[PDB]
Amino acid sequence: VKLKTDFDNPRWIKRHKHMFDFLDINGNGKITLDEIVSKASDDICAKLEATPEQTKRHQVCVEAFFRGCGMEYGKEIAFPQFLDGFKQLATSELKKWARNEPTLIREWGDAVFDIFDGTITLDEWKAYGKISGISPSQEDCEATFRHCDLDNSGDLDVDEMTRQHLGFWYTLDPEADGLYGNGVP
Ligand SMILES: O=C(Cc1ccc(O)cc1)Nc1ncc(-c2ccc(O)cc2)nc1Cc1ccccc1
Ligand SMILES: [Cl-]
């Protein structure tokens, strides 16, 4: 995977501004850990019918990821501060990768996989995509699967999902471009 960072790249900034606007529910230019974790647990995990343990595992992953960006409960954050937080998460994750230590994004994927499953199906991904709202388009979910290296059953394994997302969120890896079809730039 690309390990070199590209944090000044306008396309990398744009990718995060897209995600930030997506989590900015009321469109006030701020996001909060409170609304995000509520979305993870009270909404996504509820509709997926995750077990209480599966919900909690998913919840602690979401918390760790956004706390990695400097976020905490009861505090609003604007995009530039979030972005610098995300640069700090990104380097922490890449150092973990470089040490053969599990990343937060790997752990979150394990939590997602646990709800469904060592692989997930196109229909299962489509469910997360639509329910989380990251990728409501069936065709974009289908594009994710066309993009990724799948097993002989056409299913997605956790290591492939991990390396794609490490490249997509952290390093603007050209191999990761197109991961969400048109759903996320
Ligand atoms: O989309 C997921 C689920 C997932 C997918 C692949 C993977 O390897 C691991 C996990 N997680 C995710 N992973 C990363 C981001 C994300 C990335 C960049 C950014 O600036 C903001 C959010 N968003 C999300 C969606 C989300 C869900 C619940 C609450 C908030 C957000
Ligand atoms: Cl909000």
Ligand code: NA
């Ligand atoms: Na907001």
